Amino acid sequence: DPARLPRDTGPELMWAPSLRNSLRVSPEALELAEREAERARSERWDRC
């Protein structure tokens, strides 16, 4: 059972939301890296 919230900053007790407790994810760059690495894997499929 989770909860939903906008923002906070700079804690000391650990299980409190913050700006440093956010994973820093860029979706478009990860999709781009994922797609180009799928094509590198698909070339690696047909090598030996």
Partner: protein
């Protein structure tokens, strides 16, 4: 200032009975010099017994310790929130007092015949706050559990509600109670209406809480906590109606808010009297109004 109040009116056994309680307190009618018999404590309200009116009357008028009893007068001093006093635990339900414990005054739920003097004068009970709130809870659940087994014998048992309701506990002091085992239905008992308020507020609390959460959650984020504490209730009380006549819903909400506030002002025990240093060898305690 001047603090004495001389009230006018007894005989030898009345002298001894009033002399037994020369350290107890009781309310008055007015802060004047001379008064009559009828203006003394709890006489005109307790003779049908009903708790909430008596608590309102006890918070209404002021209070007074009595000092001396003559043949035709009772010398007594009213208490003012300025300075301090010295009162006694001279009540037949003996609850042992302790140091720096806040003392309460509740209207007498322990029967008329214990805390009285038959001439009339009815003294209120004085007893500390955790014992006060615990005896309030253990008389209220006793009321509703007696009404349930008077209604349905298969929902609870009588000895099931005497293994856990006939006794209060505070710092090892395991007292007993005088519980009214035969209240009689349709009201007519003491604490008959407070349970009747408690059940209505505990019935209207789902219709209040769901309407409040659904009305507060549309204002998007002042705070996360109104939806953060949406998981801690059960989902049975979550999906209840979400639709009613808003005339009926508003009337139910207004009645539940009024009865909730009156009940919450009553669960706060009333006039809280604070001790400083109790002495059991002397049965006296420094006390002042708070």
């Amino acid at each position: 200032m001047d603090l004495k109040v001389v009230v006018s009116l007894l005989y030898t056994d009345e002298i001894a009975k009033m002399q037994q309680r020369i350290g107890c307190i009781l309310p008055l009618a007015s802060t004047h010099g001379t008064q009559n018999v009828q203006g003394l404590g709890l006489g005109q309200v307790y003779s049908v017994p009903d708790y909430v009116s008596m608590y309102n009357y006890l918070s209404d008028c002021t209070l007074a310790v009595l000092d001396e009893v003559s043949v035709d007068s009772l010398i007594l001093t009213k208490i003012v929130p300025g300075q301090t006093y010295a009162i006694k635990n001279k009540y037949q339900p003996f609850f042992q007092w302790h140091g720096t414990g806040s003392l309460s005054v509740m209207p007498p739920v322990f029967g008329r015949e214990h805390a009285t003097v038959k001439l009339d004068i009815v003294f209120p009970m004085v007893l500390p706050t955790p014992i006060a709130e615990e005896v309030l809870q253990k008389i209220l659940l006793f009321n509703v559990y007696s009404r349930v087994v008077m209604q349905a014998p298969g929902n609870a048992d009588m000895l099931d509600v005497h293994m856990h309701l006939g006794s209060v506990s505070y710092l090892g002091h395991h007292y007993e109670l005088a519980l009214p085992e035969v209240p009689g239905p349709l009201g007519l008992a003491l604490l008959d209406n407070l349970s009747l308020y408690f059940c209505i507020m505990v019935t209207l609390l789902p219709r209040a809480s769901m309407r409040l959460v659904r009305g507060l959650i549309r204002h998007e984020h002042h705070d996360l906590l109104n939806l953060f504490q949406e998981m801690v209730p059960d989902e049975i009380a979550r999906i209840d109606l979400d639709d009613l006549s808003v005339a009926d819903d508003l009337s139910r909400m207004r009645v539940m808010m009024t009865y909730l506030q009156s009940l919450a002002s009553l669960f706060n025990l009333g006039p809280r009297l604070a001790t400083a240093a109790y002495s059991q060898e002397t049965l006296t305690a420094t006390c002042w109004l708070r």
